[PDB]
Amino acid sequence: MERYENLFAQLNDRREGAFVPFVTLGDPGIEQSLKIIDTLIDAGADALELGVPFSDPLADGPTIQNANLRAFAAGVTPAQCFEMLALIREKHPTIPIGLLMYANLVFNNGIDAFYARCEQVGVDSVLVADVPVEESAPFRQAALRHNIAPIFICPPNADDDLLRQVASYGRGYTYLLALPLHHLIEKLKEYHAAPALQGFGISSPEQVSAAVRAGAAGAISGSAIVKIIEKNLASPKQMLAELRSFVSAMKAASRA
Amino acid sequence: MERYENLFAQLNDRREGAFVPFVTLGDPGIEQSLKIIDTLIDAGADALELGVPFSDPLADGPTIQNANLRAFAAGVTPAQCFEMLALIREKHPTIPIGLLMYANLVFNNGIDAFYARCEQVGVDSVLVADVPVEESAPFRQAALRHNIAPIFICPPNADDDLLRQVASYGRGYTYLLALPLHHLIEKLKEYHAAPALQGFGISSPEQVSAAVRAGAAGAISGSAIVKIIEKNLASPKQMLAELRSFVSAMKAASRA
Amino acid sequence: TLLNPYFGEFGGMYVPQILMPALNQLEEAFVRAQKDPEFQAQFADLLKNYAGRPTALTKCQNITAGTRTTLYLKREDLLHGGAHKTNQVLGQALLAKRMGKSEIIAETGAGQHGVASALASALLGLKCRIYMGAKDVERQSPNVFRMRLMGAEVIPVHSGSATLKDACNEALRDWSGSYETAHYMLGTAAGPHPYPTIVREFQRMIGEETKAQILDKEGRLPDAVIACVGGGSNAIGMFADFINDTSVGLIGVEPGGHGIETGEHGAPLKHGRVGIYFGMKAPMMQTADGQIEESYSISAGLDFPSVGPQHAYLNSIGRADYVSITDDEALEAFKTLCRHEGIIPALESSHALAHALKMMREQPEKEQLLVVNLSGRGDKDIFTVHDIL
Amino acid sequence: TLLNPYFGEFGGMYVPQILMPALNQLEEAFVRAQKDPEFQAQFADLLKNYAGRPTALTKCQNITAGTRTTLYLKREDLLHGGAHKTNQVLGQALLAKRMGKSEIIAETGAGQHGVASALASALLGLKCRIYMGAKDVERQSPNVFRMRLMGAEVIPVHSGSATLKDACNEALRDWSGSYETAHYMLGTAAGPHPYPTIVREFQRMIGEETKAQILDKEGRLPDAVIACVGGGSNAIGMFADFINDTSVGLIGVEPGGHGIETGEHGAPLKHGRVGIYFGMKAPMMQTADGQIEESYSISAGLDFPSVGPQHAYLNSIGRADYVSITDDEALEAFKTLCRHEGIIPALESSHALAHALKMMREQPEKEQLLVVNLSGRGDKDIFTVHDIL
Ligand SMILES: *Cc1c(COP(=O)(O)O)cnc(C)c1O
Ligand SMILES: *Cc1c(COP(=O)(O)O)cnc(C)c1O
Ligand SMILES: [K+]
Ligand SMILES: [K+]
C-alpha cells in the first residue's frame, strides 16, 4: 500500500515519471533472476512488477509464456517465490514491489492467506490478471485488510462505469493498457484514480517520454526486458550490461 | 443325339454300365489334354464329358476351379476349344462327346450359333450348368434343331414335377446327382427319361458297381480324374499311367 | 413363380437346378410377408426406432448460387450404418426369421454390405458368415474389423480373382447346401428373381418419403431425381414411387471410371453387352469371348460388373436415362459439397451429385427442381480422398 | 449481467477485463435470441432438415436379457456429424450471425468440436479458424483433414504442453482482439458465463425429446438417465428437462481412466478440487500448488481437465450423482453393444453405457427403466479399439 505513495511523492518533486520493468521471477534461474533484479534496481528501476510462473498466461502471451517455462524448469516453487521475494525486500527496503498473478494461484491456499504471506514478505500490490472488477470483492477486501494495494487494468475498451470502478477500487497505481489516452487519463484524474502507469508497448525511451508527457505518471516496460534476457541467455554478464544500459536509457527519458 | 443310343444299345447287350470320365479341356496344356483324353478313351472310357473354361464355375467348385485356371493360362480360347473338339472327333468316330457349359458362353454369339458349331464339330450333347428346366426352352429347341441332346441335372431335392420335366426334355442321358436313389431311378424309368448316369462322388470301383446295380445306366467320375492330373502335374508319363489304371479299374467294375 | 421374373427381356432365374426350390421358397415367403400387416408393422418399427427413418430432405442453400436450380439431397447418409444398405438388410433378416432360418450368408467387396448384414444379424439373433475376396479383405480391413466386432464370420475368398464376382459365387455354392437353415442376403437389386423385386420393395421407402417431403416443401414434384448405379438398389429405391409420374425424370449415374474411352470404367448398362451371369440376363462387363471382367471406379462400392434387370429395362423403354461421371468429376463434387454445405458425401453418391452440378453449370438460367439421392456418408472415403489430394 | 453467472458457488466470469464487454454483448444477444420466435424457428428448421432431429430412442432388446432392466438409448450417434456437438454449434453460429459477426474461433483436442465448427461455418458462411494443440494435430489428423476439407483454418498450438488447455487459452487471446468481428464457439458447458447457460439451452432438446418419447413408448418417466461428462454439454442437455422431475435420477459418468487410485484418470468433479481457471470457478485437475494438469481417458473426447459449473452445483445439492468408469469397463461396454445390438458406440458414450450395464448386472432382479445418452458413434474409435484388441 504505502511505498507507492512515497515513490509518487518523491518523483513529483523531481518532475519525473516512474519507470517500472517487468520480469518473471526465477527466469532464467533463481540466482540469475536475483542478479537481474538487482541490476534493474541498480540501473534505475523505480518500482518492480514481478511475474510468478503459472499453467499458462492469458493476459500475456508469447514472450512471457516462454519465460514462465524457463522458470518452471528452474524449480521455482511458490515456496521459492516467497523466499526470493523476502530477500529482494531485505536488500532493497524502499523499492515498491508489485506481483502479477492469476486467480487460481491466489485462491489455492485461501485468498486471505495469500495476502497475509504477501504482507509478511513485503509485497506492496497484487494485480490478478484474470479477476475483472466485477469478480474482485473477495480479492479486494483481502488485500486491503493486509495493506496490499489491489492493482486493476484499465483497458482500451474502457467505458465510464468501468473507469469509475477502477478509480474507486484500485490503489497504488492504475495499470493503463474507442478513447484518446489523453481523455482516459483526464477521466481517471477526475475520478481520482491511483496514478496511471502506461503499460502498453513501452519499448523505446521515446515512448516513456511520450507517456509522462501525456499525463501518465510513468511507464511499465513489459516484454522488452524479457527480450534482452532471451536474446542473451548464455552471455550473462553482457545480458546484465544490456539490461543496465536499457534501464538507464528508459529511466533518463522519464526525466521530463 | 445318336451315339448315346448306340452306346446304350451296345452296353445293354453286354450287361455293363457306362463309365464316363470328366476332364476340363486344355488342362494342363492343349497337347497334354489331348494326350490325356486319348489315354482315357484307350483305357476304356465309354463316353466323354468335357468342361470348357469359364469366369468361374458354380455347379462345380474347388478342383474344377483350379483346373479352369490351368486351362486359361494355357491359352485355350473358344477357337482352340472347337479346334480340339474337331480333332478328338477325327481320331475317335464313335465315342459320345458331351460338353459341360455355362449359359453366358452359349449365349455369347447366339444360342443357335453355338449349337450349329457343336453340330459341325461332332458334339453329341450339351449340359448348360446354370439353365434350370424353367429357363431352358431357347437352349432346348436350338439343341434339338441341331441334333444335340440337351442334358439336364436331376438333383437330390428333385420333386415329381421336376422329374416329369427332366424326362420330357432331356435326351442322351439324365445326369443324376429327400428320395432314395432306387426311387428316383424308378420314377425316371416310369416317366421314360433318358438313361440315368450317376454323377455324385463316383471315385472308387466299388461305387461304379453300386450305381449300375442300383439301376443307373452308368457313372460319371468328375473330379477324381482331375485329382490324378493335379497330383502328377510334372510327372506326365506316370500321370497318364495312373489315369490308365484308374479308368481300367473303374471300367472293369461296371461289368456287373 | 407367383411374380414375373422378367423386366422385359432382362431378369430371369439362371441358376443351377438345385437352388431353384430355395428361390421359390423365398418368393412365396415374400409375397406372404407383403400381405401380412404385422410383418409390415415390425419392419416399419425397426426402420423408425433403430435405423432412423424418415431421413431428411436437405435443400442445398449455397451450392446452387447464381444458377436457377433448386437442389434437395435425400439424406440416406443419416441412416444407421451411414448408407441406405440398412433398409433392405433389416427387411431380409425379418424375412429370414419369418421363414424359420437361423443363419445369413452374404458377400462383399468394400465391406459396407458385410457390415450391414453383420449389424442386422447381431440385432435379430441370426448367425452370419460373410464371403469377401482376399483382395477386398486386404484393402477393406477397417470394415472387416467392424464385421467381426458385430460377431460375423469373415471368410476370405481366394477363387482366382478374389474380388466380389468370386465372392458372389462362393456364397451361392454355400447356399446350395445350406438353404434349409440359412438365408442368402443378397446385396443389390440384381441376381435371380426374386431378389431384384425384393431388394427394390425394401428400398422403395426412400422414394415414397422423397415424394411426400418434396410436396410438403415445394408444393410440386421434382424435375429429376438423380442417383448413382453400382448394381442398382438405392437408385431403384429412389425411382420406384416416381415411375408412374411421367413428369419426373429419373437419371442413373454409372461410374465412368478413368473415362469410358479408356476401358477403365464401371458402366455396363450403357457400355457393356447383355450376358447371362450372377443368375440373371442383364448387361455386363465382358470380353468379346463372354468372360466377365471387373468394374473400375474411384468408389469401391460401385464395382459390381453388371446392373439390375429393372434398370436395363427402364433404359430400353426410355423411361429413365443413364449417364456416367468420371472419377475426377466425383472427386470435385465431393470437395464441393464439403466446402459449401458441410456434408462429406460418400464417393459413390458424389457421382450422382457431380451429374446434378453439371446439369446446373451447363444451363445456369434453366429453372429446375432436382433431388439427388445422397446414399452414404464419406467418412470411409477420407483416407482415399487423402492420397488423391 | 442479465442472467445469474453462478450455479451456487460454481461459475463466474473470471476473465481479463478486456474480454468482459464481449461476454456481456454475447449474453445480451442470447437473451434477445431466446425471446425471438424467428430465431427459434430458424434454429428448429436446421436441426430437423439439416442435422436430423428428432433422433431416435432405441429400446435395447438383447443386452438386458435375463435381468429386469429395460434400457433405451437416445440416439445422438444418428445426428449429422455423428455426435451431439452439432446441436449447439448450429445455435451458436446462428447467434454469431444475429450479432453481425463473420468469423468463428474454436479450439479442439480430438477434432470433433473442430469438425462441428467447420461444418456449421461452411453451411452458414462464416470464416472459421480452429486452435488445436500440436500433440492433438499429430494424433488427430483424420479430423484435421476433415476440418480443412470444410474450409477451416487449423492453427497448431505449441504453447508448452500443446494440448486442449493451451488451445482454449490461445483461442481466448485471439478473441480478445477479434471480438467485434469474430465469435468464439466454445465447445462444452464450461468457461465464463454465459457459455455454461448458452451451451445447455442449445443442447436441452436431447432431454426434451427423451421425455416425450419415453412417455409415448413406456407411459412413464425413466428411473435414471445416464450420460458421460467430459466438460458436460451432452450430460446437461439430457438432464435439463428432467431437473424438476424429482422422481428421475440423473447420473453422470466421468472417466475413471486407469483407475482413480492410479491418478491417471479424468474425473475432477469427484476427485479434483475447486480452482479458478478457464474463466470459471469449478472443480479441476490440479497439483497441490494450483498448476492445472491433463485429464486422462481412453476416449480423447473426455480430456477436458475440469467440468461445467452446473454439474458441480447439481452434485453439491445432491440432485445428480456422478460416478466413474474405467477404460476397461468402457472397452467391454463398446464390444457388448456392437455384438448385441449392432450399434458401434463412441468410446466416450461407452462410459455411460458401462455404468448402466453395472447397475443391471449387480442387481438383476431390480425392475428399472433406464435411458443412456448415446452421444456419438464409434467409427473414429475402431482404430484405437483395434490396437487394444
Ligand atoms: C451400397 C452403396 C451404393 C452402391 O450400390 P447400389 O446397390 O447401386 O445402391 C452406393 N452408395 C453408397 C453410399 C452405398 O453404401
Ligand atoms: C463432445 C463429445 C463428448 C464429451 O463432451 P461433453 O461436452 O461432456 O458432452 C462425449 N461424447 C461424444 C460422442 C462427443 O462427441
Ligand atoms: K455396375
Ligand atoms: K472432465
PDB file of C-alpha atoms in Angstrom, chain D residues 228-301:
ATOM      1  CA  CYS D 228     -20.871 -39.284 -19.608  1.00  0.00           C
ATOM      2  CA  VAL D 229     -19.267 -35.991 -18.517  1.00  0.00           C
ATOM      3  CA  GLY D 230     -16.116 -34.643 -20.238  1.00  0.00           C
ATOM      4  CA  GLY D 231     -16.914 -30.931 -19.749  1.00  0.00           C
ATOM      5  CA  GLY D 232     -20.628 -31.612 -19.524  1.00  0.00           C
ATOM      6  CA  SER D 233     -22.809 -30.478 -22.574  1.00  0.00           C
ATOM      7  CA  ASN D 234     -24.436 -33.807 -23.571  1.00  0.00           C
ATOM      8  CA  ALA D 235     -24.956 -34.630 -19.951  1.00  0.00           C
ATOM      9  CA  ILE D 236     -26.614 -31.245 -19.141  1.00  0.00           C
ATOM     10  CA  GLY D 237     -28.510 -31.485 -22.477  1.00  0.00           C
ATOM     11  CA  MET D 238     -30.018 -34.809 -21.300  1.00  0.00           C
ATOM     12  CA  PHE D 239     -30.614 -33.697 -17.615  1.00  0.00           C
ATOM     13  CA  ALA D 240     -32.065 -30.182 -18.036  1.00  0.00           C
ATOM     14  CA  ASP D 241     -35.678 -31.043 -18.783  1.00  0.00           C
ATOM     15  CA  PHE D 242     -35.704 -33.678 -16.019  1.00  0.00           C
ATOM     16  CA  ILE D 243     -34.294 -31.489 -13.249  1.00  0.00           C
ATOM     17  CA  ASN D 244     -37.748 -30.612 -11.880  1.00  0.00           C
ATOM     18  CA  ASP D 245     -38.881 -34.280 -12.108  1.00  0.00           C
ATOM     19  CA  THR D 246     -37.606 -35.283  -8.730  1.00  0.00           C
ATOM     20  CA  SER D 247     -38.526 -38.935  -9.460  1.00  0.00           C
ATOM     21  CA  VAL D 248     -35.952 -39.306 -12.254  1.00  0.00           C
ATOM     22  CA  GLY D 249     -32.352 -39.897 -11.183  1.00  0.00           C
ATOM     23  CA  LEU D 250     -29.550 -38.239 -13.202  1.00  0.00           C
ATOM     24  CA  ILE D 251     -26.168 -39.977 -13.179  1.00  0.00           C
ATOM     25  CA  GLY D 252     -23.103 -38.512 -14.791  1.00  0.00           C
ATOM     26  CA  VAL D 253     -20.150 -40.692 -15.645  1.00  0.00           C
ATOM     27  CA  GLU D 254     -16.679 -39.329 -15.566  1.00  0.00           C
ATOM     28  CA  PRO D 255     -13.651 -41.176 -16.920  1.00  0.00           C
ATOM     29  CA  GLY D 256     -12.041 -43.174 -14.177  1.00  0.00           C
ATOM     30  CA  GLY D 257      -9.135 -43.686 -16.620  1.00  0.00           C
ATOM     31  CA  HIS D 258      -6.670 -46.350 -15.467  1.00  0.00           C
ATOM     32  CA  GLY D 259      -8.384 -46.222 -12.074  1.00  0.00           C
ATOM     33  CA  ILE D 260      -8.956 -43.417  -9.627  1.00  0.00           C
ATOM     34  CA  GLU D 261      -6.328 -44.803  -7.283  1.00  0.00           C
ATOM     35  CA  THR D 262      -3.660 -44.580 -10.001  1.00  0.00           C
ATOM     36  CA  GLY D 263      -4.016 -40.852 -10.547  1.00  0.00           C
ATOM     37  CA  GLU D 264      -4.296 -41.467 -14.317  1.00  0.00           C
ATOM     38  CA  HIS D 265      -7.962 -40.515 -14.641  1.00  0.00           C
ATOM     39  CA  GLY D 266     -10.168 -37.641 -15.896  1.00  0.00           C
ATOM     40  CA  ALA D 267     -12.572 -37.246 -13.003  1.00  0.00           C
ATOM     41  CA  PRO D 268     -12.253 -33.738 -11.446  1.00  0.00           C
ATOM     42  CA  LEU D 269     -15.841 -33.270 -10.217  1.00  0.00           C
ATOM     43  CA  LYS D 270     -15.457 -36.108  -7.745  1.00  0.00           C
ATOM     44  CA  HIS D 271     -11.688 -36.413  -7.396  1.00  0.00           C
ATOM     45  CA  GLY D 272     -10.136 -32.949  -8.154  1.00  0.00           C
ATOM     46  CA  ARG D 273     -10.525 -29.671  -6.065  1.00  0.00           C
ATOM     47  CA  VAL D 274     -12.209 -26.375  -6.885  1.00  0.00           C
ATOM     48  CA  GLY D 275      -9.992 -23.826  -8.570  1.00  0.00           C
ATOM     49  CA  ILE D 276     -10.432 -20.821 -10.854  1.00  0.00           C
ATOM     50  CA  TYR D 277      -9.352 -21.442 -14.427  1.00  0.00           C
ATOM     51  CA  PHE D 278     -10.720 -21.397 -17.993  1.00  0.00           C
ATOM     52  CA  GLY D 279     -12.778 -18.366 -16.852  1.00  0.00           C
ATOM     53  CA  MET D 280     -14.719 -20.263 -14.143  1.00  0.00           C
ATOM     54  CA  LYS D 281     -14.689 -21.312 -10.512  1.00  0.00           C
ATOM     55  CA  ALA D 282     -15.214 -25.088 -10.780  1.00  0.00           C
ATOM     56  CA  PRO D 283     -13.530 -28.383  -9.618  1.00  0.00           C
ATOM     57  CA  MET D 284     -10.424 -29.286 -11.603  1.00  0.00           C
ATOM     58  CA  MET D 285      -7.412 -31.477 -12.169  1.00  0.00           C
ATOM     59  CA  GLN D 286      -4.580 -29.660 -10.360  1.00  0.00           C
ATOM     60  CA  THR D 287      -1.426 -30.187  -8.318  1.00  0.00           C
ATOM     61  CA  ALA D 288      -1.198 -29.195  -4.655  1.00  0.00           C
ATOM     62  CA  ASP D 289       0.388 -25.985  -5.954  1.00  0.00           C
ATOM     63  CA  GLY D 290      -2.556 -24.846  -8.181  1.00  0.00           C
ATOM     64  CA  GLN D 291      -0.973 -25.816 -11.511  1.00  0.00           C
ATOM     65  CA  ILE D 292      -3.691 -27.381 -13.720  1.00  0.00           C
ATOM     66  CA  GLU D 293      -2.922 -30.832 -15.231  1.00  0.00           C
ATOM     67  CA  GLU D 294      -4.273 -33.062 -18.025  1.00  0.00           C
ATOM     68  CA  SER D 295      -7.303 -35.385 -17.781  1.00  0.00           C
ATOM     69  CA  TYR D 296      -6.574 -38.977 -18.895  1.00  0.00           C
ATOM     70  CA  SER D 297      -9.053 -41.410 -20.504  1.00  0.00           C
ATOM     71  CA  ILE D 298      -9.217 -43.980 -23.256  1.00  0.00           C
ATOM     72  CA  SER D 299     -11.502 -41.544 -25.065  1.00  0.00           C
ATOM     73  CA  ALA D 300      -9.703 -38.433 -26.180  1.00  0.00           C
ATOM     74  CA  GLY D 301     -13.087 -36.676 -26.218  1.00  0.00           C
TER      75      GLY D 301
END
